[PDB]
Amino acid sequence: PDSKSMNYQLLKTFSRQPIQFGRFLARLLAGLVNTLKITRTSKSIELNLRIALPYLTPQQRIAITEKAVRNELTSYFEFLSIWGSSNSKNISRIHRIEGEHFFHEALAAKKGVVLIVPHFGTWAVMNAWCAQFTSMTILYKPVKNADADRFVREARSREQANLVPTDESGVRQIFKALKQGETTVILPDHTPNVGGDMVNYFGVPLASSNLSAKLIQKTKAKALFLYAIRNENDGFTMHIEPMDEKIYEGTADDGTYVIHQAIEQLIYQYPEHYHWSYKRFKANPALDNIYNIDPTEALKIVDRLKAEALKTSTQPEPIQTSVM
Amino acid sequence: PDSKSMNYQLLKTFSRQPIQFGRFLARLLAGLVNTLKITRTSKSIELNLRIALPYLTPQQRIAITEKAVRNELTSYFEFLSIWGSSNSKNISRIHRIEGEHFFHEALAAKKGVVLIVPHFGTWAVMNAWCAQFTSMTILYKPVKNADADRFVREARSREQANLVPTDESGVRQIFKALKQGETTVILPDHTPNVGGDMVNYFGVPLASSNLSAKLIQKTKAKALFLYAIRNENDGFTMHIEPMDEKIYEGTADDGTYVIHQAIEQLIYQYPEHYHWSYKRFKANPALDNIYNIDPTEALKIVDRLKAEALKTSTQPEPIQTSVM
Numbered sequence A, B: 001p002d003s004k005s006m007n008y009q010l011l012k013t014f015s016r017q018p019i020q021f022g023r024f025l026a027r028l029l030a031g032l033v034n035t036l037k038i039t040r041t042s043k044s045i046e047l048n049l050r051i052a053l054p055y056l057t058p059q060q061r062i063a064i065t066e067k068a069v070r071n072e073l074t075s076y077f078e079f080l081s082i083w084g085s086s087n088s089k090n091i092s093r094i095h096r097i098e099g100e101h102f103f104h105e106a107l108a109a110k111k112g113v114v115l116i117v118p119h120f121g122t123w124a125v126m127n128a129w130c131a132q133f134t135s136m137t138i139l140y141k142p143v144k145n146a147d148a149d150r151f152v153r154e155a156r157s158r159e160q161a162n163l164v165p166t167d168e169s170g171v172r173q174i175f176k177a178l179k180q181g182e183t184t185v186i187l188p189d190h191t192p193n194v195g196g197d198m199v200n201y202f203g204v205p206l207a208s209s210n211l212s213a214k215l216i217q218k219t220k221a222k223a224l225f226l227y228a229i230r231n232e233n234d235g236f237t238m239h240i241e242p243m244d245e246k247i248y249e250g251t252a253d254d255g256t257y258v259i260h261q262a263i264e265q266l267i268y269q270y271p272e273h274y275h276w277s278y279k280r281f282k283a284n285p286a287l288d289n290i291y292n293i294d295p296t297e298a299l300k301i302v303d304r305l306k307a308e309a310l311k312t313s314t315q316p317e318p319i320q321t322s323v324m
Ligand SMILES: CCCCCCCCCCCCO[C@@H]1O[C@H](CO)[C@@H](O[C@H]2O[C@H](CO)[C@@H](O)[C@H](O)[C@H]2O)[C@H](O)[C@H]1O
Pocket: A076, A077, A080, A139, A140, A141, A142, A143, A144, A152, A156, B006, B010, B011, B014
């Protein structure tokens, strides 16, 4: 009787679509199979977990890898439902919130609020809820495909999000919004398309955005660390956590490192909910090709590198922050 | 602008489903990724094409393999739409029919009609159309999953198909229906679960059903060879072709071989429309593990085997039909 290798509701919904729908979807899936994109993604997830969580045993690593594949794909289907739904419904999708106090307090302080959202869990579900208490200005990068871009921006417009370009005009508009006491959402854990700073990530110096830290340290806005995880029964639990006050100290690179620590701790606790498909660890000049070589050699290069970042740090010369 | 890496209608339909739908579908897809079923299927398609069409060049073989992956997946989504639709709509899905004359003539003869349908193209689309001219009795094997079985049988009941078990009681009911001048549909190109006859298939002796030939040679029913191919624009072209009269001669094994020839010719003409995922070539005691070993060694074993089936055939002893 081995089970739920389909549901009848599923089959009936697919069955009621036009033939064109099925043909287009099959062409999409087949394109994914024929170009090996699915295998490539699975292997990048596996390598990333080997890099960041080297203490897992082979068995634990298999369970986590399989669950992370499942969970990230699930998150993206969930995003489809979220971006097809009204604000009311998306708000009612939040069943439990932890740390709401810090959000309302940060809004009371009227110094601005920077919501720091890693690519983790079902993060797109939080926006509707946040939006009922504050205006939000958000960096937006148009999706490469026009129809998808279209869809996403109906979603964001329904949320009343103020979308701004991912360039210095968008950054200026975010500074302005924070000055007025409003809110922005930054996902800080991808590699910037242009620039910037070599900041350690799981012990590996990686080129990293400084945006969060620059906004926070200049405006003295409050920084909150946010994430949402699906519940056993169709709901989500949202978590709001204040950023360590160290984030205000030092250079933007120092604050960036504090954000990195928060991300690391979240992953350590919930490794199966991080979105591991992204090829983050390529962002070092020694690591440009680690997703394209033999996984074991890749790991040896990474280990060499983490080994040098320690002594060059006790050493007074800035080896690891030098960009060439 | 590279394109139709999604459509907006697609995204909006997925977006309007409940969150449960997305979670269940992602769990399904992820299960497929995590158990390597997708890679395994792709490799079985590739091996089957190497076995049956050894004259293809590597480039031609890649184009055909990719198109066959696309086309079989497309066929199954099309089956979903067909089995969710009314008879009227499914009939209007047939835009062009070739050889309709032979079908109406076979019904006029009132000796019964056996429709021989390879697993090819979009074969499930033909049933509704056939059903408006004749009653149909069909072998049915319950789908392993209960919900899917459910769905499929609403589809067949709406078609007024008389489903019968895949055992000798079903065979007796099909004989009875043919005696009355009615029609049956047999898909003859899979390996039987129990028995039977070593019949050459692309030069390889494979255990094969004899059902079609036994029905046809006893009842003298007319045998028609049927297949449907999707058109450029959302329709399908159906093809009805009389079976070579040799099918009436000799043993059931001889008639089975005539069906095999018809299938071979259809594949030679339309290799991209055959459903190549099925592991048909395992059905020989020398070939039990060819989908699980190195593809080149597999092909060497197959070539050895086709090499012996020739001389043992000119030789008077029945080497290849001996079942042990
Ligand atoms: C219909 C097929 C089934 C549906 C599921 C398809 C999964 C598609 C995921 C492909 C890989 C991720 O694809 C990537 O997703 C992110 C969101 O994370 C998009 O990001 C886009 O939306 C987010 C949030 O509104 C913005 O912050 C971002 O600026 C914008 O570019 C990227 O533009 C897209 O390239």
